[PDB]
Amino acid sequence: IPAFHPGELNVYSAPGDVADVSRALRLTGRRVMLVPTMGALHEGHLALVRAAKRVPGSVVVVSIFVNPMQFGAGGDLDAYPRTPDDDLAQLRAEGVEIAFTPTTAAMYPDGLRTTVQPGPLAAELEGGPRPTHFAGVLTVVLKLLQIVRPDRVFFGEKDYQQLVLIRQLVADFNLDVAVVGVPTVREADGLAMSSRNRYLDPAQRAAAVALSAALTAAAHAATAGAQAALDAARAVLDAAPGVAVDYLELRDIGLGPMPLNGSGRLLVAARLGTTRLLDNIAIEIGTFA
Amino acid sequence: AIPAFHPGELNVYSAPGDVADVSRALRLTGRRVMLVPTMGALHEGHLALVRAAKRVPGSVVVVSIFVNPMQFGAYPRTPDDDLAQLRAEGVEIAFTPTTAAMYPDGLRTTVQPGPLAAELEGGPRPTHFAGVLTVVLKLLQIVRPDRVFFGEKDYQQLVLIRQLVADFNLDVAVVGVPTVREADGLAMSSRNRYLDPAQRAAAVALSAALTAAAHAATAGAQAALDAARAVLDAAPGVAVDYLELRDIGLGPMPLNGSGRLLVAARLGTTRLLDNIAIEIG
Numbered sequence A: 001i002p003a004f005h006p007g008e009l010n011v012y013s014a015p016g017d018v019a020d021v022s023r024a025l026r027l028t029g030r031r032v033m034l035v036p037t038m039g040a041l042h043e044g045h046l047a048l049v050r051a052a053k054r055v056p057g058s059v060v061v062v063s064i065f066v067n068p069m070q071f072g073a074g075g076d077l078d079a080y081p082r083t084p085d086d087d088l089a090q091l092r093a094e095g096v097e098i099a100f101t102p103t104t105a106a107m108y109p110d111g112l113r114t115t116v117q118p119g120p121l122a123a124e125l126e127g128g129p130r131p132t133h134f135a136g137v138l139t140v141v142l143k144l145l146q147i148v149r150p151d152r153v154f155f156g157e158k159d160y161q162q163l164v165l166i167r168q169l170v171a172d173f174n175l176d177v178a179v180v181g182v183p184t185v186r187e188a189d190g191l192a193m194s195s196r197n198r199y200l201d202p203a204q205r206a207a208a209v210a211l212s213a214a215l216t217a218a219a220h221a222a223t224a225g226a227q228a229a230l231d232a233a234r235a236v237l238d239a240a241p242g243v244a245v246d247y248l249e250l251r252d253i254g255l256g257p258m259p260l261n262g263s264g265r266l267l268v269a270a271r272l273g274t275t276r277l278l279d280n281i282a283i284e285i286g287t288f289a
Numbered sequence B: 001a002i003p004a005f006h007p008g009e010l011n012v013y014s015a016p017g018d019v020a021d022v023s024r025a026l027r028l029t030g031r032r033v034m035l036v037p038t039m040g041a042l043h044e045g046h047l048a049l050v051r052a053a054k055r056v057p058g059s060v061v062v063v064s065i066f067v068n069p070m071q072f073g074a075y076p077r078t079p080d081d082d083l084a085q086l087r088a089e090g091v092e093i094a095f096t097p098t099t100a101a102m103y104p105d106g107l108r109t110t111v112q113p114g115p116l117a118a119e120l121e122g123g124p125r126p127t128h129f130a131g132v133l134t135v136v137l138k139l140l141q142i143v144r145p146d147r148v149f150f151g152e153k154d155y156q157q158l159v160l161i162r163q164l165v166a167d168f169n170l171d172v173a174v175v176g177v178p179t180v181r182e183a184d185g186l187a188m189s190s191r192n193r194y195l196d197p198a199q200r201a202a203a204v205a206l207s208a209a210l211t212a213a214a215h216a217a218t219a220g221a222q223a224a225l226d227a228a229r230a231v232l233d234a235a236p237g238v239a240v241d242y243l244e245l246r247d248i249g250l251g252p253m254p255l256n257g258s259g260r261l262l263v264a265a266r267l268g269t270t271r272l273l274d275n276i277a278i279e280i281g
């Protein structure tokens, strides 16, 4: 058709359906907000939804799509958590009017043909041993932006490298959307929220606080300079039982071919058993506050 | 404050943000925005593009003029005459950005075309089509046209733009415009003036070969190919790079049905291309 029941959760699977409804809402003056997710929603996703909601006269579109193109072969794709019933229930509770739940076939009818090739940042940090990963992310986000044509698109600072790449996408392709980054939601001990946190047993869950503890220690130590920041983070991680650090890196905020001068981001990735966790924090070098 | 726009006059903007704002504002005033991407040095081929765009009711025509550095290997520039030609066509918007304005962060995020981009013209130039789809995407995003107009002359380019559009869910209609030709059939191109008289006379073999082939095709695909090959074989100094019959999307030619016959050839230093619709049987 498609029908749109205002004040209720409308679920569309067809790209054409959501595109038409979005086009219609935008033509009546409502401002279209997009929150792209892969489902398995937790409270940090709900913060994304809330921030979009607070935009005056917004209509909130939340996409749920476990994008196969951002996964490397092996079992990562099949192993991704799927909790559709909880996801949709959470969106209704939040007063979301639109959930977009496309099929793989609707998204990729010609498989991998035209795709987005990210800049050299895609080859680093998370992309190091996963060199097609961000091409996957950026290909899907580009499509979702073209399908929904939102005014603003909301991402978490949690997957900070991804946020940077998305701002690159938007800049480099002249996309008429505002990219809104939302501060990471944390458990009460500091643990960054993630759909991956379900894979930590009680021992791993206890040990996992070491990531955020290491980052906040570094952010405070940073008055004393970069080395002191990094060493404080390293000390905490080294004190933590069964935390296998992948990388701990201090970068310029754009993550790119510029040196760290003053304002930076400290990024960590670590393994707890088979569970790979990420966190990051703002760092100010020589700044007490 | 939206940049100044004067209806019925050629309005020239170099800033991507400016044409973006004027285009958006215009669409709201009840215009349909038509984009014709060019690399300048305009001839009758481009004018056919412009007239196609103009005839759409409520059209405002955006002609972009940008020599895309990214579609050249890992040139004519007539700005004044270009702009005067557009004025004579009643085109109201020219978009003439700089390389710096188009690539302000340099070459970073780009479009990776599909596997068709490595075939045919992507043989000699394996990065050419990445360069084209990247700039076309950017132009589409800047101008946000209802319809975008490309020639059938660069057929493989046109198919790849159709793939871009489907594959990225772009909200634009791609309009293919038939090749404008010289009096003897030679497909128009700024390259043609480079041919010496001997080459210019032999150059008519590309179109002749294709038209022969289209008419031979009632006897089937192999007759059509053999006919085309015969005409090219009658021409001196025409180095055929390829002659291929494909389906209209440039996949394999099916048993019968619509297809497209494509040819490329070097005459001295000048590469010429042509293509034609073929109906098999």
Ligand SMILES: O=C(O)c1ccc2c(c1)OCO2
Pocket (backbone or CB within 6 Å): A044, A045, A047, A048, A155, A156, A157, A158, A182, A183, A184, A185, A192, A193, A194, A195
């Ligand atoms: O995608 C996430 O796992 C995530 C997790 C936490 C977030 C967030 C996103 O946005 C703001 O807080």
Ligand SMILES: O=C(O)c1ccc2c(c1)OCO2
Pocket (backbone or CB within 6 Å): B055, B056, B057
């Ligand atoms: O020139 C026209 O009369 C005309 C009228 C309607 C058209 C059109 C051309 O292109 C597609 O929609």
Ligand SMILES: O=C(O)c1ccc2c(c1)OCO2
Pocket (backbone or CB within 6 Å): B044, B045, B046, B048, B049, B150, B151, B152, B153, B177, B178, B179, B180, B187, B188, B189, B190
């Ligand atoms: O780009 C060209 O050289 C060209 C040449 C001929 C054309 C055309 C473009 O659009 C339709 O007819």
